[PDB]
């Protein structure tokens, strides 16, 4: 059982290659997750210069195997059950009245490090809009992440609506559609319907000259 890999603190590496309206960029990240607390801490650097999109729009792309599954729900932690071999995470993210991100990720162990490698593609964004015009506040809210099994794909289907606070007091919704399928052929837990209560907080390293993001996530499963 993959649950075993998560009983202590696990180091994490993150790598993302992106292209939004033709603007290419790369990000690298490191930190650690502790599933016993449901805690994740990560720092990201844009290695190509300036990030062409707002940092909060990439938060959900930048490892739900670090959720805390209460003991009575351990039967439904598909994320852990897929490791070490790992799992594919794909999303399409529809920004209300704007463009969309499509993403492709693999989350897996390489020895003692959990690795999350992402490709991201965004298109049809307005040059005046909240995203390309950098009108999102640098902050994040709480959301519920709804998980249901997908028996035919041997995986899960996931959906939620992220609320991005805009600097003029409006809110920009980002509608997430998500699926996850194992990478190995080992058996995986297909869960009953449930959700992950997700909270996050963004901040900055003042000793960091490069464009960057410090990310903190707290995630606990619920609904059973």
């Amino acid at each position, epitope marked *: 059982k993959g649950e075993e890999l998560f009983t202590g603190v696990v180091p994490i590496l993150v790598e993302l290659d992106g292209d939004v309206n033709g603007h290419k960029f790369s990000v690298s990240g490191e930190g650690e997750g502790d599933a016993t607390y449901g805690k994740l801490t990560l720092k990201f650097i844009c290695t190509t210069g300036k990030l062409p999109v707002p940092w909060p729009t990439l938060v959900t792309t930048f490892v739900q195997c670090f959720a805390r599954y209460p003991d009575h729900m351990k039967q439904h932690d598909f994320f852990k059950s897929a490791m*070490p*071999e*790992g799992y594919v995470q794909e999303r399409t993210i529809f920004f209300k009245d704007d463009g969309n991100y499509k993403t492709r990720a693999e989350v*897996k*162990f*390489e020895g*003692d*490090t959990l690795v999350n490698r992402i490709e991201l593609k965004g298109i049809d964004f307005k040059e005046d809009g909240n995203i390309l015009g950098h009108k999102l506040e640098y902050n994040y809210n709480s959301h519920n992440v709804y998980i249901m099994a997908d028996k035919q794909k041997n995986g899960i289907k996931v959906n939620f609506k992220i609320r991005h606070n805009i600097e003029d007091g409006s809110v920009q919704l980002a509608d997430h559609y998500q699926q996850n399928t194992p990478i190995g052929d080992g058996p995986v837990l297909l869960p009953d319907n449930h959700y992950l209560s997700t909270q996050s907080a963004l901040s900055k390293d003042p000793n960091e000259k490069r464009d960057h993001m410090v990310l903190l996530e707290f995630v606990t499963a619920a609904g059973i």
Partner: nanobody
Amino acid sequence: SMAQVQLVESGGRLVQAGDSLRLSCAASGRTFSTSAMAWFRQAPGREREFVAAITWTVGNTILGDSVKGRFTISRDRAKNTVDLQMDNLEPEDTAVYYCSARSRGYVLSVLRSVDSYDYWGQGTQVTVSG
């Protein structure tokens, strides 16, 4: 969207004991998913034997006991190659050298085992004469 990866070894030669040689492997296909690559070697009448492995993201390396301090594995993610630098070659290094790759994630201990890889090249011959 295909998982298939293809591996092409090169560089095997006939060489004198105490010489060095560099082998190279080229991966293509869904290289995005690669998580480890490795070199094994097989001599006639013998089981295939672990030589060296390298984790793909970080570059952590594992060497088989009988090449420790002589062989060096390294990989280049931009070119999707993994090279095996063999110094101080001995007649007993004579074998066909195979390149392999894994895409599933793993704990480190399974990487020495032939059964832990999803893709294999067709080998390149190394002969060491003394």
